[PDB]
Amino acid sequence: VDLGTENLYFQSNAMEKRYSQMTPHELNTEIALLSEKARKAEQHGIINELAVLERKITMAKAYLLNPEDYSPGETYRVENTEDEFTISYLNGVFAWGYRTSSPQQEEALPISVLQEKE
Ligand SMILES: [Cl-]
Numbered sequence: 001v002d003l004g005t006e007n008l009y010f011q012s013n014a015m016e017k018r019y020s021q022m023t024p025h026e027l028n029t030e031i032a033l034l035s036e037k038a039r040k041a042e043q044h045g046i047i048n049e050l051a052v053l054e055r056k057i058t059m060a061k062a063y064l065l066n067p068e069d070y071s072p073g074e075t076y077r078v079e080n081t082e083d084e085f086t087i088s089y090l091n092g093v094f095a096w097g098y099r100t101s102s103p104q105q106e107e108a109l110p111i112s113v114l115q116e117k118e
Pocket residue numbers: 015016019059060
């Protein structure tokens with residue numbers, strides 16, 4: 001068993017544990033540092049790395065938000081897409097629900113990507 005293929009499960013859990021204990025100021029500092037590294041990756045076209053950093057930023061941003069500001073049963077726009085996502089329930093910093101374009105698939109998205117409808 002090459003459990004190393006699951007490297008990101010352990011990295012992800014460590015990140016979430018770390019962010020869950022941060023103050024808002026610490027999260028803002030983390031996001032600023034990640035954003036500066038992302039800017040550098042973007043300016044050099046290092047796409048893979050830019051994507052890794054942006055996924056971390058999206059997660060850090062979810063820890064700054066308040067899960068109670070999101071409502072089960074409400075439908076939101078998924079940031080940077082033309083999709084709509086209806087929330088089934090919240091757990092941690094994620095909203096479990098489904099996209100109106102794939103209503104047979106329950107799935108989870110960080111609350112930071114849910115935008116109130118316009
Ligand atoms: Cl995180």
